[PDB]
Design a protein around this ligand. Structure first.
Ligand SMILES: N#Cc1ccc(CNC(=O)N2CCOCC2)cc1
Length: 211
């Protein structure tokens, strides 16, 4: 086992194959402990989950500081934090996976290159190298800064995201809201008038597929 695993891939290779809460260590630094939910079953496992929607119990209409820091219950609905995402994605080349499920139908998107810039970039999104079944709805968002109501798409749709004008992905939108562009949307899968029941966003090293 690795003593200070820097992500869920180094925690999984540590022989922990059950999905659930693990400690990772940013930059392998024992002073930078972070509790994360690891999805150890989806497409080979080793994924840090950084967003989960599943029941509408948690409020995602939250401010910049909340999106920077993270909020919620890792075992249920939560957001990991943009500062965490920046520090993880700085450690190497990461891949994004998005898992979606609605009324028994499932879809996914994988982006071979995924990174989140630091606060001086307003947590700029990079997403490249799409494959999957959900449709490439993140391409629209590539290179955009993060937006919250207090830093207007976030205000207009009462969510938070790497908004443009405004979205094809709104996974931090209002739960069960089928009104146009208000809900948990992935446009190239279920459009803007269908709020998705279950959504996860997760990341792991892009080289995990052959390590
Ligand atoms: N994944 C995740 C996730 C991230 C943060 C929270 C709650 N916020 C939080 O832990 N911060 C940082 C440490 O002290 C308390 C404030 C919940 C879920």
């Amino acid at each position: 086992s690795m003593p200070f695993p820097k992500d869920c891939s180094q925690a999984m290779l540590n022989g922990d194959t059950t999905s659930g809460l693990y400690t990772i260590y940013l930059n392998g630094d024992k002073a930078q402990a972070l509790e994360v939910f690891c999805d150890m079953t989806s497409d080979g496992g080793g994924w840090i989950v950084f967003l989960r929607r599943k029941n509408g119990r948690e409020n995602f209409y939250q401010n910049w500081k909340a999106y920077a820091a993270g909020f919620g219950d890792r075992r249920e609905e939560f957001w990991l934090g943009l500062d965490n995402l920046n520090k993880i994605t700085a450690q190497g080349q990461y891949e994004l996976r998005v898992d979606l499920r609605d009324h028994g139908e499932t879809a996914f998107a994988v982006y071979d290159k995924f990174s989140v810039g630091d606060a001086k970039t307003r947590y700029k999104l990079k997403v490249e190298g799409y494959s999957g079944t959900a449709g490439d709805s993140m391409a629209y968002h590539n290179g955009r800064s993060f937006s919250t109501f207090d830093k207007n798409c976030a205000l207009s749709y009462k969510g938070a995201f790497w908004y443009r004008n405004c979205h094809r992905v709104n996974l931090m939108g209002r739960y069960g809201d089928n009104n146009h562009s208000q809900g948990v949307n992935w446009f190239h899968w279920k459009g803007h008038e269908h709020s998705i029941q279950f959504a996860e966003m997760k990341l792991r090293p892009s080289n995990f597929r052959n390590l």
